[PDB]
Amino acid sequence: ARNVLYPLYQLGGPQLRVFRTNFFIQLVRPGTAQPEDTVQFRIPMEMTRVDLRNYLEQIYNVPVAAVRTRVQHGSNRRRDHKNVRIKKPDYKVAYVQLAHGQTFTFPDLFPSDLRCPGIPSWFGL
């Protein structure tokens, strides 16, 4: 869940449960060359790597072995017609290696007459 307030925890407090999840993730073909089991994901910047591990294991029942994540800086060089800098939204790329010996491969999605010129052919005269 993103853009929401999380309950503050105190000693002896309840375990944190998210009944409704606002996190939305996208599977992306790796830009770089990565092992087949490794999978690249674009996830909200507020999500932690542990959250992805629980997210895949619970929502999608996907076994995960290892996770590596990076934060990509959004270029702000772009300017509008008014010369106002435009900032690309920052996104987080997560490299997730499958467990139990599972392997992943990106699906192949999106698999007149020439002799008489200048006289319109309509004329029969």
Binding site: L8, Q10, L11, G12, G13, P14, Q15, F19
Partner: protein, 198 residues
């Protein structure tokens, strides 16, 4: 932003209204929702224009410019598909008609009779002719997308008709979070310590 025949936000619209354009705005007399009486499918008579005096059915209404489009009327001929290889193909393209250029037609007597808005027994607003008072029923227009609701067949991820119509909500003294707990049997005995809200 000058509204044109091209739909707003289209590629043609962008050419018509580029970001740097500062042309003199076109002034169009405001028309209230109650005042407006022309709707798609309405048979109307063209008061003035190329096809003045020819009655047609409305197919598009750009209320921002008070424009009414009649299919097969006020239709000029233009070249579609103009390219380097081929000159293009002549096609008949309709031109916008202003609201004052058309008037509603009484069904029994075909004339440009001025109309006044009045409710009916059912409560639906219907235009009534000022003279020879009569009810002009709202015309039937086909769905723009072309999808007939009855003919539509559920595709993948589309609920069946009965499933959508089923009602399962039971009013009770429990929130959704509590309701989910009962079904899945979530129980928590831990308690948050006192927090001073401020």
């Amino acid at each position: 932003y000058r509204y044109g025949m091209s739909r707003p936000g289209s590629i043609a619209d962008k050419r018509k209204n580029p970001p740097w354009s500062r042309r003199r705005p076109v002034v169009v007399e405001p028309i209230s929702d109650e005042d407006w009486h022309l709707f798609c499918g309405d048979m109307v008579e063209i008061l003035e224009g190329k096809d003045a005096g020819k009655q047609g059915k409305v197919v598009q209404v750009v209320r921002q410019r008070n424009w009414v489009v009649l299919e097969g009327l006020n239709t000029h001929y233009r070249y579609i598909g103009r390219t380097k290889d081929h000159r293009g193909t002549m096609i008949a393209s309709e031109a916008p008609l202003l609201h004052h250029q058309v008037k509603l037609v009484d069904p029994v007597d075909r004339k440009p009779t001025e109309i006044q808005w009045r409710f009916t027994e059912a409560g639906e607003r219907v235009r009534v002719s000022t003279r020879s008072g009569r009810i002009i029923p709202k015309p039937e227009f086909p769905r723009a997308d072309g999808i007939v609701p009855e003919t539509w067949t559920d595709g993948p991820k589309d609920t069946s008709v009965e499933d959508a119509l089923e009602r399962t909500y039971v009013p009770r003294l429990k929130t959704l979070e509590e309701d989910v707990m009962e079904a899945m049997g979530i129980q928590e005995t831990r308690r948050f310590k006192k927090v001073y809200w401020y």
